[PDB]
């Protein structure tokens, strides 16, 4: 099998940015290299077939170079319908693999989080579950970190976490981690904290609430 | 005007069988390589198979030799993926999509056009309407809904009938280990305005025929 590398995973541009990706094979593919523009909910399109050919359509700020190991593609001048995921696909040989694919974010200044914390209800504690959730809101770069803490214990496994897509109107992010404990381990407890860590906060904010 | 309409996902469990059809318009079907695809949630694009275009030469990714089944049917101008012993990690989108080759050998080239995708969704989990928990505010303020235990995808949620749209945050789903999803909506509002200001939250879950209002109140 030959692995496609693909980097960066992610990067944050502005319109009119050159931008450049890599696509790395673990062993000679020649020329045997697709490129694949990907949006949220949509179908791949190809842009770029045999390393350095351009699919009939695609704007010619797309480039694509390269043979045996390395590939690069380039957008000269990036656009606003740029914004999306890119992938690389070796055509060589069997099994045809893609590279891990290469989000293109908006730029934007830094915006630290709005935090909020939310205790479970007293409706859902009558079916058993405890429920801890914190929003943080607004939010730029994407990268955050949030530790929970009950009575100074570190909760680990317990939690799941998802992030919005850049809002269309100031290319922010949100979001919202769970914090999932049975109602018996819920009721044992008092202390309930949810430590937020950002490049736009000089230090961690912390939002708790005793139950 | 060239068409690759896909149809056949569903939700099933696992060990039992889907097959998808990928029916070609407006060009020489019986001349183009096609492949099959598919992107778990969240995840890359995956390679699962490929048949030559008279249907003799066909190659499979390793996780599913054995289970799936790539074939063509040219006087109809379909493609068809019969996918057996279905796993939880088959669960993705499945794209079909032609492939011209190269070569005399005519093996594959580039995947110039692409059906839209049908849904795969293997999970032992029934069918489950959600409950919906407030996110109440306290002392710009957030609040919000917790849309909990519900199967399958997906739910709508909207805020005092389509009526508050700016400051809402609805977030993407999230899998549960218990195999039921969950997600929350979020929306701030000036802290002044909760005393008087309404908040409802409509959540419909069209496969379990459940819809449910709730409004959030400071507790």
């Known amino acids: 099998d030959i692995q496609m590398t693909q980097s960066p995973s992610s990067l944050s541009a502005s319109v009119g940015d050159r931008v450049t990706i890599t696509c790395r094979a673990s062993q000679s593919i020649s020329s045997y290299l697709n490129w694949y523009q990907q949006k949220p909910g949509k179908a791949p399109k190809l842009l770029i077939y045999?390393?350095?050919s351009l699919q009939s359509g695609v704007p010619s700020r797309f480039s694509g170079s390269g043979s045996g190991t390395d590939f690069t593609l380039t957008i000269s001048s990036l656009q606003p319908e740029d914004f999306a995921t890119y992938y690389c696909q070796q055509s060589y040989s069997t099994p045809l693999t893609f590279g891990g694919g290469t989000k293109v974010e908006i730029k934007r200044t830094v915006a630290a989080p709005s935090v909020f914390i939310f205790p479970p209800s007293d409706e859902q504690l009558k079916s058993g579950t405890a429920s801890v959730v914190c929003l943080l809101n607004n939010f730029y770069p994407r990268e955050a970190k949030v530790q929970w803490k009950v009575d100074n214990a570190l909760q680990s496994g317990n939690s799941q976490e998802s992030v919005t897509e850049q809002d269309s109107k100031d290319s922010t992010y949100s979001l919202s981690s769970t914090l999932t404990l049975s109602k018996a381990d819920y009721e044992k407890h008092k202390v309930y904290a949810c430590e937020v860590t950002h490049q736009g906060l000089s230090s961690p904010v912390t939002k708790s609430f005793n139950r | 005007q060239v068409q690759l309409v896909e149809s056949g996902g569903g939700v099933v469990q696992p060990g039992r069988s889907l097959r998808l059809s990928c029916a070609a318009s407006?060009?020489?079907?019986?001349?183009?390589?096609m492949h099959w695809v598919r992107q778990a949630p969240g995840k890359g694009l995956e390679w699962v198979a490929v048949?030559?275009?008279?249907?003799?030469?066909?190659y499979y990714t390793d996780s599913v030799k054995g289970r799936f089944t790539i074939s063509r049917d040219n006087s109809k101008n379909t493609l068809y993926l019969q996918m057996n012993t279905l796993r939880a990690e088959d669960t993705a989108v499945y794209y079909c999509?032609?492939?011209?080759?190269?070569?005399?050998?005519?093996?594959?080239?580039?995947?110039?056009?692409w059906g839209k995708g049908t849904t795969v969704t293997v999970s032992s989990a029934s069918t489950k309407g959600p409950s919906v928990f407030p996110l109440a505010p306290s002392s710009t303020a957030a609040l919000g809904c917790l849309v909990k235990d519900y199967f399958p995808e997906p739910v709508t949620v909207s805020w005092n009938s389509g009526a508050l749209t700016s400051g809402v945050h609805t977030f993407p789903a999230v899998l549960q280990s218990s195999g039921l999803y969950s997600l929350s909506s979020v929306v701030t509002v000036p802290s002044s305005s909760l005393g008087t200001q309404t908040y409802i939250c409509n959540v419909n879950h069209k496969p379990s025929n459940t819809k449910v209002d709730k409004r959030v109140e400071p507790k």
């Open positions: 407006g060009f020489a079907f019986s001349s183009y390589g």
């Open positions: 999509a032609r492939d011209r080759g190269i070569g005399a050998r005519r093996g594959p080239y580039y995947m110039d056009v």
């Open positions: 048949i030559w275009f008279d249907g003799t030469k066909k």
């Open positions: 045999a390393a350095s």
